[PDB]
Design an enzyme around this catalytic site. Structure first.
Site, mmCIF file in Angstrom:
data_model
loop_
_atom_site.group_PDB
_atom_site.id
_atom_site.type_symbol
_atom_site.label_atom_id
_atom_site.label_comp_id
_atom_site.label_asym_id
_atom_site.label_seq_id
_atom_site.Cartn_x
_atom_site.Cartn_y
_atom_site.Cartn_z
ATOM 1 N N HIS A 147 0.707 -1.247 -0.013
ATOM 2 C CA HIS A 147 -0.099 -0.064 -0.049
ATOM 3 C C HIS A 147 0.988 1.333 0.056
ATOM 4 O O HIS A 147 0.075 2.428 -0.183
ATOM 5 C CB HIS A 147 -0.948 -0.041 1.079
ATOM 6 C CG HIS A 147 -1.978 -1.057 1.023
ATOM 7 N ND1 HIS A 147 -2.825 -1.310 -0.035
ATOM 8 C CD2 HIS A 147 -2.286 -2.256 1.820
ATOM 9 C CE1 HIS A 147 -3.588 -2.294 0.340
ATOM 10 N NE2 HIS A 147 -3.019 -2.741 1.331
ATOM 11 N N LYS A 167 -3.764 -10.198 -8.315
ATOM 12 C CA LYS A 167 -4.398 -9.573 -7.273
ATOM 13 C C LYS A 167 -5.705 -8.813 -7.965
ATOM 14 O O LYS A 167 -5.407 -7.615 -8.620
ATOM 15 C CB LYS A 167 -3.493 -8.995 -6.357
ATOM 16 C CG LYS A 167 -4.487 -8.401 -4.895
ATOM 17 C CD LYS A 167 -3.463 -7.696 -4.090
ATOM 18 C CE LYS A 167 -4.423 -7.437 -2.782
ATOM 19 N NZ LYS A 167 -3.555 -6.479 -2.044
ATOM 20 N N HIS A 219 -3.928 -3.266 7.615
ATOM 21 C CA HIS A 219 -5.117 -3.367 6.693
ATOM 22 C C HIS A 219 -5.379 -2.113 5.970
ATOM 23 O O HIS A 219 -5.484 -1.326 6.759
ATOM 24 C CB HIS A 219 -6.274 -4.247 7.065
ATOM 25 C CG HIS A 219 -5.896 -5.552 7.584
ATOM 26 N ND1 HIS A 219 -5.624 -6.615 6.885
ATOM 27 C CD2 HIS A 219 -6.031 -6.017 8.903
ATOM 28 C CE1 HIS A 219 -5.520 -7.814 7.455
ATOM 29 N NE2 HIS A 219 -5.779 -7.358 8.932
ATOM 30 N N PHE A 220 -5.671 -2.363 4.695
ATOM 31 C CA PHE A 220 -6.538 -1.086 3.925
ATOM 32 C C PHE A 220 -7.743 -1.436 3.885
ATOM 33 O O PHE A 220 -8.226 -2.242 3.091
ATOM 34 C CB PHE A 220 -5.718 -1.149 2.680
ATOM 35 C CG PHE A 220 -5.882 0.564 2.066
ATOM 36 C CD1 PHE A 220 -6.949 0.655 1.344
ATOM 37 C CD2 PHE A 220 -5.161 1.700 2.311
ATOM 38 C CE1 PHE A 220 -7.396 1.941 0.861
ATOM 39 C CE2 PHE A 220 -5.449 2.656 1.820
ATOM 40 C CZ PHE A 220 -6.512 2.865 0.914
ATOM 41 N N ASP A 221 -8.777 -0.529 4.471
ATOM 42 C CA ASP A 221 -10.203 -0.835 4.659
ATOM 43 C C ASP A 221 -10.683 -0.195 3.386
ATOM 44 O O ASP A 221 -11.852 -0.949 2.824
ATOM 45 C CB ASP A 221 -10.737 -0.597 5.875
ATOM 46 C CG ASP A 221 -11.990 -0.885 6.078
ATOM 47 O OD1 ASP A 221 -12.293 -2.288 6.129
ATOM 48 O OD2 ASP A 221 -13.116 -0.464 6.270
HETATM 49 N N1 LIG Z 1 -9.992 -0.216 -1.604
HETATM 50 C C1 LIG Z 1 -9.264 -1.277 -1.404
HETATM 51 C C2 LIG Z 1 -9.841 -2.444 -1.222
HETATM 52 C C3 LIG Z 1 -9.184 -3.623 -0.854
HETATM 53 N N2 LIG Z 1 -7.993 -3.676 -1.094
HETATM 54 C C4 LIG Z 1 -6.981 -4.782 -1.117
HETATM 55 O O1 LIG Z 1 -7.563 -5.954 -1.168
HETATM 56 C C5 LIG Z 1 -7.422 -6.795 -0.011
HETATM 57 C C6 LIG Z 1 -8.626 -7.609 0.438
HETATM 58 O O2 LIG Z 1 -9.937 -6.735 0.124
HETATM 59 C C7 LIG Z 1 -7.114 -5.702 1.054
HETATM 60 O O3 LIG Z 1 -6.252 -6.650 2.022
HETATM 61 P P1 LIG Z 1 -5.515 -5.928 3.243
HETATM 62 O O4 LIG Z 1 -6.416 -4.862 3.848
HETATM 63 O O5 LIG Z 1 -4.986 -6.929 4.095
HETATM 64 O O6 LIG Z 1 -4.266 -4.964 2.650
HETATM 65 C C8 LIG Z 1 -6.145 -4.995 0.378
HETATM 66 O O7 LIG Z 1 -4.910 -5.314 0.020
HETATM 67 C C9 LIG Z 1 -7.275 -2.322 -1.353
HETATM 68 O O8 LIG Z 1 -6.083 -2.408 -1.310
HETATM 69 N N3 LIG Z 1 -8.145 -1.197 -1.629
#
Ligand SMILES: Nc1ccn([C@@H]2O[C@H](CO)[C@@H](OP(=O)(O)O)[C@H]2O)c(=O)n1
Ligand SMILES: Nc1ccn([C@@H]2O[C@H](CO)[C@@H](OP(=O)(O)O)[C@H]2O)c(=O)n1
Ligand SMILES: [Cl-]
Ligand SMILES: [Cl-]
Ligand SMILES: [Cl-]
Ligand SMILES: [Cl-]
Ligand SMILES: [Cl-]
Ligand code: NA
Ligand code: NA
EC number: 4.6.1.18
Length: 124
Positions: A12, A41, A119-121
């Site tokens: 990210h 991905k 995590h990127f939500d």
């Molecule tokens: N807006 C978003 C939604 C999902 N994602 C990616 O997709 C994955 C699963 O939805 C996320 O896992 P992480 O948040 O663990 O990084 C993230 O890597 C993203 O990068 N941006």
């Protein structure tokens, strides 16, 4: 065997550019962050801010995560971001991504000591 914090950084963070400058940004970045090795991905966001600024979000506005957990934080300011999302023409091993550059708030989940993004939500 990658830590959660290190995985977040790899997936990210892109502090070296201010914004995506071309339609090929995502194709390039998805490959060089090793996000297309085994499978394409489908969706991945890169943040064009310093690591410190992204880490600082873990002390900003506490909000619910999509999954109902309560360790998410929304950045007070917008940030330069690029959304990378597979196109319909994408088929492993020939992954293909649409690049969408935007300035938006980020929402991250934070964990640990130090309490850092894992995590990127979402972006808003
Ligand atoms: N807006 C978003 C939604 C999902 N994602 C990616 O997709 C994955 C699963 O939805 C996320 O896992 P992480 O948040 O663990 O990084 C993230 O890597 C993203 O990068 N941006
Ligand atoms: N797409 C990727 C790229 C790296 N990684 C993680 O990052 C590590 C490399 O630093 C990988 O270890 P392996 O090489 O044992 O799979 C794996 O734990 C990942 O889980 N997914
Ligand atoms: Cl930087
Ligand atoms: Cl930094
Ligand atoms: Cl912080
Ligand atoms: Cl509050
Ligand atoms: Cl806000
Ligand atoms: Na690579
Ligand atoms: Na940085």
């Amino acid at each position: 065997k990658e830590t959660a914090a290190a995985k977040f950084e790899r997936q990210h963070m892109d502090s070296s550019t201010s914004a995506a400058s071309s339609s090929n940004y995502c194709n390039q970045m998805m490959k060089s962050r090793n996000l297309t090795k085994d499978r394409c991905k489908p969706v991945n966001t890169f943040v064009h801010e310093s690591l410190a600024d992204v880490q600082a979000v873990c002390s900003q506005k506490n909000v619910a995560c999509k999954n109902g957990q309560t360790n998410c934080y929304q950045s007070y300011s917008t940030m330069s971001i690029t959304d990378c999302r597979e196109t319909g023409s994408s088929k492993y091993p020939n992954c293909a991504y649409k690049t969408t550059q935007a300035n938006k708030h980020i929402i991250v989940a934070c964990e640990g000591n130090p309490y850092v993004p894992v995590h990127f939500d979402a972006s808003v």
